[PDB]
Design an enzyme around this catalytic site. Sequence first.
Site, PDB file in Angstrom:
ATOM      1  N   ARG A 139      -7.252  15.833  17.054  1.00  0.00           N
ATOM      2  CA  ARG A 139      -6.906  15.501  15.670  1.00  0.00           C
ATOM      3  C   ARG A 139      -7.770  14.377  15.108  1.00  0.00           C
ATOM      4  NH1 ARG A 139      -3.272  18.266  18.008  1.00  0.00           N
ATOM      5  NH2 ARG A 139      -3.959  16.978  19.743  1.00  0.00           N
ATOM      6  N   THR A 140      -7.842  13.246  15.799  1.00  0.00           N
ATOM      7  CA  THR A 140      -8.479  12.096  15.177  1.00  0.00           C
ATOM      8  C   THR A 140      -9.979  12.345  15.026  1.00  0.00           C
ATOM      9  OG1 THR A 140      -6.739  10.734  16.204  1.00  0.00           O
ATOM     10  CG2 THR A 140      -8.592   9.583  15.219  1.00  0.00           C
TER      11      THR A 140
ATOM     12  N   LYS B  57     -25.083   4.490  31.697  1.00  0.00           N
ATOM     13  CA  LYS B  57     -26.019   3.634  32.415  1.00  0.00           C
ATOM     14  C   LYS B  57     -25.574   2.176  32.411  1.00  0.00           C
ATOM     15  CE  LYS B  57     -29.772   5.437  29.903  1.00  0.00           C
ATOM     16  NZ  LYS B  57     -31.195   5.803  29.647  1.00  0.00           N
TER      17      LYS B  57
ATOM     18  N   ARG C  47     -12.940   5.567  19.381  1.00  0.00           N
ATOM     19  CA  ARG C  47     -11.767   5.635  20.244  1.00  0.00           C
ATOM     20  C   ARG C  47     -12.246   5.158  21.604  1.00  0.00           C
ATOM     21  NH1 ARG C  47      -7.378  10.408  20.980  1.00  0.00           N
ATOM     22  NH2 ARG C  47      -6.732   9.331  19.086  1.00  0.00           N
TER      23      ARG C  47
ATOM     24  N   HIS D 261      -3.533   2.316  16.988  1.00  0.00           N
ATOM     25  CA  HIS D 261      -4.050   3.568  16.434  1.00  0.00           C
ATOM     26  C   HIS D 261      -3.630   3.563  14.973  1.00  0.00           C
ATOM     27  CE1 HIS D 261      -5.312   7.575  15.920  1.00  0.00           C
ATOM     28  NE2 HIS D 261      -4.550   8.204  16.798  1.00  0.00           N
TER      29      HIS D 261
END
Lengths: 311, 312, 311
Positions: free
Chosen positions: A57-58, A87, A108, A136
Amino acid sequence: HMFELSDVIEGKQFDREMLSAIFDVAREMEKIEKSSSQSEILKGYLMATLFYEPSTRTRLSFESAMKRLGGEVLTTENAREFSSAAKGETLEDTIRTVEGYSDIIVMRHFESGAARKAAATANIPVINAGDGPGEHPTQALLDVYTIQSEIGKLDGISVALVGDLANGRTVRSLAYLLAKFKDVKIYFVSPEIVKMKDDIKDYLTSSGVEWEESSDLMEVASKCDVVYQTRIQRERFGERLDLYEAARGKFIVDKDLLGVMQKKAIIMHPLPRLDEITADVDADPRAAYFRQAKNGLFIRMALLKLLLVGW
Amino acid sequence: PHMFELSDVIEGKQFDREMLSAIFDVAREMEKIEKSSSQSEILKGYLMATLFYEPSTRTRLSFESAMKRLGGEVLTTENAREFSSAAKGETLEDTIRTVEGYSDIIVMRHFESGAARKAAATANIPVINAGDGPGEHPTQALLDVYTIQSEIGKLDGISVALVGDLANGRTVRSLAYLLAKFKDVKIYFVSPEIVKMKDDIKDYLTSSGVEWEESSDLMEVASKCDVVYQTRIQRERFGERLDLYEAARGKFIVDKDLLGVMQKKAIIMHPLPRLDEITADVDADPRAAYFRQAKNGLFIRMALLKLLLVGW
Amino acid sequence: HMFELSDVIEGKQFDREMLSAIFDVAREMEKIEKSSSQSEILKGYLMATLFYEPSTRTRLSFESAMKRLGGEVLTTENAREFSSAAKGETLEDTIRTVEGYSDIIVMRHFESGAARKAAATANIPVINAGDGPGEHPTQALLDVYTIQSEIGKLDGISVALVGDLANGRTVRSLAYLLAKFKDVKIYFVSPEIVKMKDDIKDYLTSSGVEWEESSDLMEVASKCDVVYQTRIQRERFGERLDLYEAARGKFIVDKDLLGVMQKKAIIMHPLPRLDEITADVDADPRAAYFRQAKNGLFIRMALLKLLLVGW
Ligand SMILES: O=C(O)C[C@H](NC(=O)CP(=O)(O)O)C(=O)O
């Protein structure tokens, strides 16, 4: 005129007037999204995504929001393996690099606190798309907008927050924003082992929000405008199999639960769900969780517009 | 208007001084475009296909941003080993022939040296080497030289320190190669003894009119240079000798004390990513140029995409 | 007028008249793709991809098709790990989520039947980009378009389907479409372990298509207009890597095979190939598999246009 926020990181950045103005913009974005004509509001702007954890969704709503407004997107959909984070590159170095290629970053991360560090490092706006298990904020915004859209008001509502209340960032953040409105009642519905923590309880009390704890979802649901569901993972019971068995089948949204609910009430869920909402419930017009996800598109369109071109 | 003289961007030896200077002028034009509010349409209608077989932040995202800033579009393959039909066993030649049917230019980072050359020979559209395993990374070398020109104001008559695993270092070798196209350049090599610059570069530099000097004293070298070009010491080059990696890793650090000996208008560069070989303190100094360097990659890659697709 | 299909899921959805009309649209899409002007036919539309298995040609041809028509794309190029399907989300929930962000869904799944489930759930068009070892309708469409283009006829052709027929979603859908033409003969050439499944055989028999199994590829190739080679589908063998290795190396298209084929015949392969067509075949003008893959761009342009804006 510039948006007063330089980044969208946490729920405490928002006050009631700001929420109302953002929701007004989101309603205009619905009109844009339903039109046949391609918007060019964000023509020439680029968004960089940085997803260190999975998302449906996000991630997709932000990318769709950008493209529906005429902007473009540079995606990094699994940053710990496909970017130079693999890395050993630090977050701060990633941010200072990617900002050279883009106008806004949507991230995120996997650790709480990352979004605030990214905002402090970046000289372009950052939007927190989920800060590991922490904040969130755009989920909380779309959750409140969905209530307003479906119920028609935020003052005077009764909301049940159900499931893993102790550890659930979504229910905690929704409670936090609902407290900016008047005459709100919140029911905390859960097993005792995952009850809402004292920080949210004390904040609601200080804010004038009435709240009540219950383990009886059937009783609560008959009195609520909104039932907002989340899962309780088996692991949250720890070794207490007795408590897992006592809770079994008691915190599910099923057809029987809908049978006691008011005609104008709704079921919400931030998603993804598993069996804590049965498939039968989906057939009821009161099942609002896919409309809720769609509302995330409008909210995220609004925020991208405000952060990139202002009011 | 005339065609770009290169059909692909594969290796440093394709570039002469005149071509470098001309590309850098185009990159300055691209900087003006990128700063403008108006969306460019120079590459409207063109499609880039990326093929990343190894991880990337700077090279992958700068190429995609460059294309989109010019109005073109991009088809990404971000982990080709896993999500492309290379996962089914496909040869590079088959992949390239396939992808050219969907696109106008291919940008590829492979894991085997020689892959970029094989891709250019297969393809009838331009190919850009975005890093070729242990092999060349030519657009990094171009952006490195451009960054020196932009920051220092000149390329003739400069002093550059190259620091790190010089034996195996891809970017330091290619930077040295291009700097030798200019005049009165001096290069200092600073490395652990086990990973000194190989003789092939040393002989090419002497042959080309570049003075060079090896030193184990980074503090002495850094005080005499316009540019300190730092690199990351990498574990893989030390095989089954973790002890040798750890010994090498700690030796030559760009820290506050090193900046304290450098000239007022010198710079610190690094192709990135870094680990601890430039301390966080250094980031606060205006001479820390590695983030400006990364941004310059956008302008250089805009220039190359434009030149390869629509010419001068 | 509107396109008569709401989704592109199964080869049996297409009748002969529809195939001929789609091929005409594909020829118009080839003119668009060869032209120097950017098309805006699909400006304002967004395609979401959902790839739960790897893909090069199908994924990139759909994305290129969309962008060449002026639309945009939201990619989920590894849905099993990078989306919330990694957290157990059902397909139906993924589809109902993604449809809020997009106008058409292109999905490749690892389970047969997934595309039909998605179509039944979604209120926007779905295209099956491969559903496990089940079907691959757009490969079949581009394959028949390629045969028509290269041989100049479909009625009366003789086609050899070679290799992994049991698991070959390509040859399964291709068989369904070839049955819409008259006087066709199909030869099946495979190791016994991967012979064509009974559902396809029974459908061809009921449709009056002549078919024959043979283990003599040189004899079969000498009398066919089309030799359609396939990869042995390793990912469908599960843990039976013994059977996988036993099925390889038995039927190879090499220079000796081309030497017995007719001058007007072609070699096709949906790709990728491993060892089953030798590299020296590529230089022969009858080696049609790269032209075949290019034709996929035009066919997929046609389908996106038809499903979104009609005839
Ligand atoms: O993979 C094959 O062997 C045949 C067939 N191939 C394709 O569709 C081409 P790709 O896998 O590159 O999209 C498939 O069924 O996926």
